[model samples]
Target: AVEVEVPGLLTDHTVSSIGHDFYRAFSDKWESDYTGNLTINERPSARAGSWITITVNQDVIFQTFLFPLKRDFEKTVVAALIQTEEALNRRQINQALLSTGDLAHDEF
Candidate 1:
């Protein structure tokens, strides 16, 4: 099963809210059929902004910066979701190809 986690304390509440939105969106989109981990991390920047990092299976897939003054929560979530889906699809394809490669020798 795919797991979504937001593991960190975000200094900015706006950024934290965005992270939660992503977690819920990811869980809702990939409830089953996918096997991997999705982690969301946030770090406070020097200029009162936050850096958001989204990872899949320990690989960084999408990242962005959010500030309290200008925050587009929906757009950010949508973009991250698209990126995550693409990464998951690529992994699935690669796994399928690997399995096929292993079968090639057995048939001979």
Candidate 2:
């Protein structure tokens, strides 16, 4: 997995458009296979838009989403272009540590 942070101004139009744009982008531009979270401005009276924070798997941005959209290419078309195979492999190995011994079966 990867982690990403998108910090900037966002308005209602752009906020809502994320879903539509993201769906299309993901379909034709990239993939979001990991978890993510978006933090909206908490101030009650946000008039000048707000600083929305988007956090997601790093692959969701650097290798997958942003560039593909900018380059106007299907993610699948350039899937191998970013060549995160090494990083991806490392992530898998790291996560595997959570599945062994008492950690895997541990419960709260």
**Which 10-residue window of candidate 1 scores lowest in summed lDDT?**
5-14
RMSD of candidates 1 onward, in order: 9.0, 13.2
Model 1: runs farther than 4 Å from truth?
A: 1-33, 46-48, 93-108
Measured by TM-score, how close is model 1 to the native structure?
0.53
Candidate 2 per-residue lDDT, tens place, 5-98, comes to 3442222222422333433333243332222221121122233322222223322322232221243434433442223332443455346444
lDDT of 1 by residue, 1-108 (tens): 244643432122224544545556554554323544566777766576667777665678778876556667656766766666566655574576565543333222
Cα-based TM-score, every candidate: 0.53, 0.23
lDDT of each: 0.57, 0.31
lDDT value for model 1: 0.57
Off by over 4 Å in 2: 1-23, 27-34, 38-72, 76-93, 97-108
lDDT for position 44 in model 2: 20
